[PDB]
Every structure is written in structure tokens, then in C-alpha cells.
Amino acid sequence: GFRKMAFPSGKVEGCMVQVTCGTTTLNGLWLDDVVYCPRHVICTSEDMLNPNYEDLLIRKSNHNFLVQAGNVQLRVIGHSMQNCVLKLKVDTANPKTPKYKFVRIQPGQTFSVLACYNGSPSGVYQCAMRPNFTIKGSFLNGSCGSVGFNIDYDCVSFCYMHHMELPTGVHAGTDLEGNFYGPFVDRQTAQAAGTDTTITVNVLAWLYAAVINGDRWFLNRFTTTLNDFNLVAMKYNYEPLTQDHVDILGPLSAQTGIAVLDMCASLKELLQNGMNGRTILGSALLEDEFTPFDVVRQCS
Amino acid sequence: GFRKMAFPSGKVEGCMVQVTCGTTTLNGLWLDDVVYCPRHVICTSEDMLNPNYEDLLIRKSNHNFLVQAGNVQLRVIGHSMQNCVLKLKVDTANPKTPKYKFVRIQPGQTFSVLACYNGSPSGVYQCAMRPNFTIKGSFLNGSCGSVGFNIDYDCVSFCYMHHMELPTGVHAGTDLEGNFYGPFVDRQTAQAAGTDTTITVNVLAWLYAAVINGDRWFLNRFTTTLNDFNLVAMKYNYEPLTQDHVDILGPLSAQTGIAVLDMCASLKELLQNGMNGRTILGSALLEDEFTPFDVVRQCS
Amino acid sequence: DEVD
Amino acid sequence: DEVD
């Protein structure tokens, strides 16, 4: 085995609140004197089909919003919209507010979710932003408004908020400035995700992790070119590899003494011939939810 | 997918400290005025082969132990041994001390590890106590003294401390009263784990999770007896199932409308015939690190 | 599905 | 192995 670890969640736990609007309850993020949650909290079951969020929000008063931080009712003194995120000004700055930034991540990048039920931390898991900007994850009992995050030194980088589930049962949401990842809208209408491809650079990081942990059967004599690798990659629904992806893998190459194009040759054969009933780090499938950065972090 | 979630780690993060003895650094747990860590911190590289821990500990002064909580050097006023766990009395009660108990868990039960490097929280993952009392996990850079825990309502139940890696590369350690799980000793000598069997009751919980999430291909017309199931189970290195395991699965049975012995018949066929290149919740192998309690928790 |  |  080689464990998919989440970041420690403590700094995020102290920021999770319950947000209620009528019969709708979901999770909010309480930073300084502002609570962030999905704007679709202001919607009635009717409204969700084609909501006019400006008209719906104009109709709401400060007192239509119930914010609970543990046992404390917070006083809403202001309500506003940044894209698809509702911003509730409360009369108290969160005294547990960590140092934080809002970042927009790239498809293939990983992050931790603190899954919450009615403002209460329930669980933490590590996932990837799929190439089609969806998230495979949490069963979702009152999971709307649960946030994704990286910890960078002493700083929480908030990168994601859960808004909705798609037909396929994958999840979609926004950055903390309320812009969707992918072509999705907070409207109850049938919306297609792109083809979900495998994150090749992550699969290569994980083969590197397998070698570091002494799992070596899949190494072959062969090398390959980026060009010839990418033709095979595209046949099996794998993202094309670029020189930047080669450069990103450099530390794992140097540590293992296995060139990137030699590991690429190993992956090529695995795709063409399958695993012949064998496993790598105790998985029967190639794992793509570890970045090169994740493997380096955990192999130190 | 269906996510293996860890408990939120915040209440544990505020208790993790660095413990140094000479050139040896590892993780300690700071609760009230006591730091707990593996006693093998007092060992020189020589000593690890056949240590007399009483003689080694008698030779140490309070001042041989360096305890760092973030930027603060803690003052050690007392040193003692409970079985394989070192207990350092410090002159300050941890002001972040959560409500806690020390529990001894059973093989097949799951828990979260806060993996730490030199007293610093690094990552959180969910695992099972293997039937042979080992832990498959963390790569281990200064991971000795990292603790396992469940959160029960508002209480942290500490159940595990990492002490060592076995030949096979699995991990072994103690409860917080310093008793090993399994037949292992904190001595650098070759020690065998038992046969590692699959946790049948967990595999059944996870097939239940698969049905709840609409993954249904592996359901068959057949039923079976516990008796006939257990003969096949034992052939494939699966733990025998008991009536208590049947009773434990009751809520998942009732929710799904699938009797336990019918799901047992499904598992029997999967063992006998394999998965024919199909997957369940996006895994090509049967998953045994979810308890019936874990599935119920996450499916609510 | 935006329930809830 | 009890390193570290």
C-alpha cells in the first residue's frame, strides 16, 4: 500500500457553519466577518429550474438567513452575491479564522475536502479535480457548501466549494469567488460533463511511488518518445504528456534513477497489455489522484 | 466512487509534539501534563537489538528529553514507562487537550491516523487494524509516535500509536497504555506477522455501500447458509462470518432490502469466478477497510 | 441535482 | 525496523 492522505483539517473545522434559508440547510465557510455558501440556498424547489438569483436575493432580508456556529446564532447584517457564492456579512469576525488565500486550481491538481453535515465536520478525504472539472466523492447528505483546500506552509488555500451533483453522480462547484469549474450552472437542468480522461502525469507520479516502495515488476527494457507515448495515451483516454509534465517529474526520476521516458515506456506496455492479474501498491487499477508534488511530500 | 474518509483531525493536531532523545527524534502526544511516545526513543542503534528498557530509562535524566510544542520548549519534570509507552510529565497541561479516552480496538475495526513528521501534522488517512494486528500505511519519515483515533460524539478515542515497521513493510504499535497489538516487541529482531486475512464483514458492508450508490451487477438469484459461505471464505483467505457479523449488517440489509445471506451468496460467486474485468465503486478489488458502522455513518 |  |  501507499496511502492517499488528506491535509490535516483542524484550521478548516473552526470555520464551518450551518446556513439555513427557509427549509434549505447547507454548509457555510466563516472567515473574518463573512460566511460563504452556495447561492442556491435562496431557491425554492420550483425556483431551481430557472432561478433569477438577483430577483430571489433582492426578495430576501438579513433575517431570512439563519447562521449557526456550533451553539451560537450569528447575526447577519448584510447579504450579497459574488457570482454563484452567497456572502453573508455577520456582526462577529471568526476568532478561529486561519491565515487563508482563495486560489483557482487546475484540472489534475489534488486537494482535501472537509465533508460537513448541517455545518458539522463529518470527514476529510483527498481527491483530484478531474480533467472534465468534476469531483468523484462524498455521498452528499447535506454536503453542499463543503470546501476543498490545500495547506501551504501555515496558510489554508481554499480552492473549491461543492454546489451540486450531475446526472452521472459526480460533483460540481466553484472557487471561493463563486466561478464554476467547468461549463456548469447552479440551475436544475440536465448538464453534460466532458469525457473524463485519466491524469497521465499523476499515474506516472504513482508508478514512481511504487518503485520508491520497492514495487518494480512493471519496469521494462524499453524507452519511448513523448510523441509515440501520446498516440497510445489518446487511444486509452489518457491526457497527452508535455515537456512541463516531464520537468515536474524530475525529482522522482532523479531519486529512482529511472528516466521519465523509460517510465512512460512502462505505462505504454501496461495500457497495451493490462496488468495480467497483478497489482501495484495493492491496487488492480492505475491510480491518478496523486500529483508529482503529493508523492514528493509523502516520500520525505 | 465511494470515499474512504478520515475523521476530522483538528482535536488531535493540537496535541502532537516533537520528542528528541540524543540523535533520535519522533512524535509524542501531549494530553493534560503528560507526553506519550514510543519508549524506543531512549535506545541507541546498538541498544535496539536487545534493549533492557528499565536499565536504559534509569540512565536517562529529565534533561535528556527535548519536548517541542511548535516554537515552545516544554519542561520535563518526570519520566516513566507504561509497558512500551514512555510517559514524560511536563510542567504545563496542554491547553488544547480535547476530551479523550484510551480504548483498545479489535482486529477489523477502522480508525484515522494523523501522520506526523518531527511533531508536525503532515496528513490524515483512514485504515483498518488487519486481522494479524498490523497496519498497512504511511511511508514513515519520522512517523514513529503518530496516533490512531476515532471521534465518538465530542470525545477523541485514541486507539493506536505507531512504534515500528516489520520485514514485510507493514506497521505495528500499541494502544496508549503501551500494550502491542499482535505478538510484536519493540526490539530490532526478525518478527513474523500471522497470515493477513480479508475482513469479510467489511467487504459485505462495502457491497452494501455499492448497492446504496446504485452499483448492482454482482447481485445474483442465489442465497447460501453461513456454514456453506464460511467453507468457501476460508478457501480464499477470508475471515469466517458469525451471527454477530450478520446482526451488525442489519441496518444495511433493511435499507437495501437485501438479506445478509443473499449478499453472502453474491460475495461467494465473486470469490469463485472473479470480477470478469468489471469494477465496484470504481475498484477492481473487494475493499475491506470500511466497517458496517463506517458505511452507515457516511450513508446518512 | 442541487438537493441540498 | 524502529528507525525512527
Side-chain angles (χ1 to χ4, degrees):
Chain A
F2 169 85
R3 292 287 183 176
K4 202 181 285 158
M5 298 203 289
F7 286 96
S9 68
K11 288 188 169 196
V12 182
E13 292 170 44
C15 301
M16 299 308 309
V17 298
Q18 189 185 237
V19 187
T20 304
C21 202
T23 75
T24 303
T25 296
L26 44 65
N27 303 291
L29 181 71
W30 179 26
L31 294 179
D32 299 316
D33 58 352
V34 175
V35 190
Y36 308 77
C37 67
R39 65 174 178 171
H40 78 243
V41 70
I42 68 176
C43 296
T44 75
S45 286
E46 299 153 323
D47 287 327
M48 262 320 292
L49 190 139
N50 195 207
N52 188 306
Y53 282 105
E54 278 166 27
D55 290 349
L56 292 176
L57 182 63
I58 286 178
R59 242 95 82 175
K60 295 293 173 200
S61 294
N62 289 338
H63 73 264
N64 296 124
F65 304 105
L66 195 130
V67 190
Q68 319 208 285
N71 262 128
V72 190
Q73 47 268 108
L74 303 193
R75 163 92 64 102
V76 173
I77 57 164
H79 61 298
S80 85
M81 195 150 68
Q82 201 170 13
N83 302 301
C84 297
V85 166
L86 188 62
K87 283 167 53 176
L88 302 174
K89 211 199 217 223
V90 295
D91 73 14
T92 313
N94 187 349
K96 293 178 196 181
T97 299
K99 291 168 192 161
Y100 71 96
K101 342 192 124 180
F102 295 166
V103 301
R104 192 172 176 92
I105 58 160
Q106 306 267 257
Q109 299 195 311
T110 60
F111 60 92
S112 297
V113 173
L114 183 62
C116 300
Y117 197 56
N118 309 147
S120 199
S122 162
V124 63
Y125 64 88
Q126 187 82 348
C127 65
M129 183 61 76
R130 298 313 306 173
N132 67 358
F133 293 105
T134 64
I135 299 75
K136 308 195 198 199
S138 49
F139 193 61
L140 209 152
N141 218 27
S143 266
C144 279
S146 289
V147 298
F149 69 90
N150 286 283
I151 306 190
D152 303 326
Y153 185 43
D154 58 347
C155 186
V156 181
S157 294
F158 293 107
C159 62
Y160 178 78
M161 175 169 279
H162 174 42
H163 288 235
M164 63 197 210
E165 194 180 303
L166 269 27
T168 51
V170 298
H171 305 281
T174 67
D175 58 33
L176 267 295
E177 259 112 30
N179 306 112
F180 268 88
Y181 292 98
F184 311 115
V185 297
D186 45 356
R187 175 189 173 193
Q188 189 188 117
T189 193
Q191 309 173 51
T195 314
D196 192 3
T197 53
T198 310
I199 313 151
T200 308
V201 73
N202 291 5
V203 174
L204 291 166
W206 179 80
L207 293 182
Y208 273 114
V211 171
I212 282 166
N213 275 284
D215 218 341
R216 268 197 64 120
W217 64 263
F218 47 86
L219 298 172
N220 62 36
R221 73 181 52 37
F222 304 131
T223 203
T224 185
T225 66
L226 217 51
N227 225 310
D228 306 333
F229 173 80
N230 286 343
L231 289 164
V232 178
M234 268 127 57
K235 167 162 213 317
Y236 292 92
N237 212 29
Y238 271 57
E239 274 177 333
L241 205 69
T242 74
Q243 184 57 39
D244 282 1
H245 294 148
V246 177
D247 290 339
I248 288 159
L249 287 161
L252 291 179
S253 196
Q255 192 193 172
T256 53
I258 299 171
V260 170
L261 295 174
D262 290 349
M263 192 67 85
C264 285
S266 279
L267 176 52
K268 175 188 267 177
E269 186 184 298
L270 285 176
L271 289 189
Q272 275 160 0
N273 308 353
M275 287 211 215
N276 270 288
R278 256 184 310 192
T279 71
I280 296 169
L281 290 165
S283 174
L285 308 166
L286 306 172
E287 169 77 70
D288 75 347
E289 291 206 353
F290 290 94
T291 67
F293 173 88
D294 300 326
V295 174
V296 165
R297 217 173 79 240
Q298 189 180 138
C299 302
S300 295
Chain B
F2 169 85
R3 292 287 183 176
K4 202 181 285 158
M5 298 203 289
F7 286 96
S9 68
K11 288 188 169 196
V12 182
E13 292 170 44
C15 301
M16 299 308 309
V17 298
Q18 189 185 237
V19 187
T20 304
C21 202
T23 75
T24 303
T25 296
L26 44 65
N27 303 291
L29 181 71
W30 179 26
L31 294 179
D32 299 316
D33 58 352
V34 175
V35 190
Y36 308 77
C37 67
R39 65 174 178 171
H40 78 243
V41 70
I42 68 176
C43 296
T44 75
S45 286
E46 299 153 323
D47 287 327
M48 262 320 292
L49 190 139
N50 195 207
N52 188 306
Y53 282 105
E54 278 166 27
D55 290 349
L56 292 176
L57 182 63
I58 286 178
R59 242 95 82 175
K60 295 293 173 200
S61 294
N62 289 338
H63 73 264
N64 296 124
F65 304 105
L66 195 130
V67 190
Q68 319 208 285
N71 262 128
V72 190
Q73 47 268 108
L74 303 193
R75 163 92 64 102
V76 173
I77 57 164
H79 61 298
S80 85
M81 195 150 68
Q82 201 170 13
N83 302 301
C84 297
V85 166
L86 188 62
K87 283 167 53 176
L88 302 174
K89 211 199 217 223
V90 295
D91 73 14
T92 313
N94 187 349
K96 293 178 196 181
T97 299
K99 291 168 192 161
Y100 71 96
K101 342 192 124 180
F102 295 166
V103 301
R104 192 172 176 92
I105 58 160
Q106 306 267 257
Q109 299 195 311
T110 60
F111 60 92
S112 297
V113 173
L114 183 62
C116 300
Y117 197 56
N118 309 147
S120 199
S122 162
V124 63
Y125 64 88
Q126 187 82 348
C127 65
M129 183 61 76
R130 298 313 306 173
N132 67 358
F133 293 105
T134 64
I135 299 75
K136 308 195 198 199
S138 49
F139 193 61
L140 209 152
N141 218 27
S143 266
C144 279
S146 289
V147 298
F149 69 90
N150 286 283
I151 306 190
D152 303 326
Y153 185 43
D154 58 347
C155 186
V156 181
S157 294
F158 293 107
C159 62
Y160 178 78
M161 175 169 279
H162 174 42
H163 288 235
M164 63 197 210
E165 194 180 303
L166 269 27
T168 51
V170 298
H171 305 281
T174 67
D175 58 33
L176 267 295
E177 259 112 30
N179 306 112
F180 268 88
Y181 292 98
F184 311 115
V185 297
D186 45 356
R187 175 189 173 193
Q188 189 188 117
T189 193
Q191 309 173 51
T195 314
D196 192 3
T197 53
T198 310
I199 313 151
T200 308
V201 73
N202 291 5
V203 174
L204 291 166
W206 179 80
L207 293 182
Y208 273 114
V211 171
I212 282 166
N213 275 284
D215 218 341
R216 268 197 64 120
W217 64 263
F218 47 86
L219 298 172
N220 62 36
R221 73 181 52 37
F222 304 131
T223 203
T224 185
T225 66
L226 217 51
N227 225 310
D228 306 333
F229 173 80
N230 286 343
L231 289 164
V232 178
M234 268 127 57
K235 167 162 213 317
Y236 292 92
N237 212 29
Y238 271 57
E239 274 177 333
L241 205 69
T242 74
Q243 184 57 39
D244 282 1
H245 294 148
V246 177
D247 290 339
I248 288 159
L249 287 161
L252 291 179
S253 196
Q255 192 193 172
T256 53
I258 299 171
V260 170
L261 295 174
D262 290 349
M263 192 67 85
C264 285
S266 279
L267 176 52
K268 175 188 267 177
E269 186 184 298
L270 285 176
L271 289 189
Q272 275 160 0
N273 308 353
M275 287 211 215
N276 270 288
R278 256 184 310 192
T279 71
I280 296 169
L281 290 165
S283 174
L285 308 166
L286 306 172
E287 169 77 70
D288 75 347
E289 291 206 353
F290 290 94
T291 67
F293 173 88
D294 300 326
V295 174
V296 165
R297 217 173 79 240
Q298 189 180 138
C299 302
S300 295
Chain C
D1 186 351
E2 286 77 19
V3 166
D4 257 57
Chain D
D1 186 351
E2 286 77 19
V3 166
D4 257 57

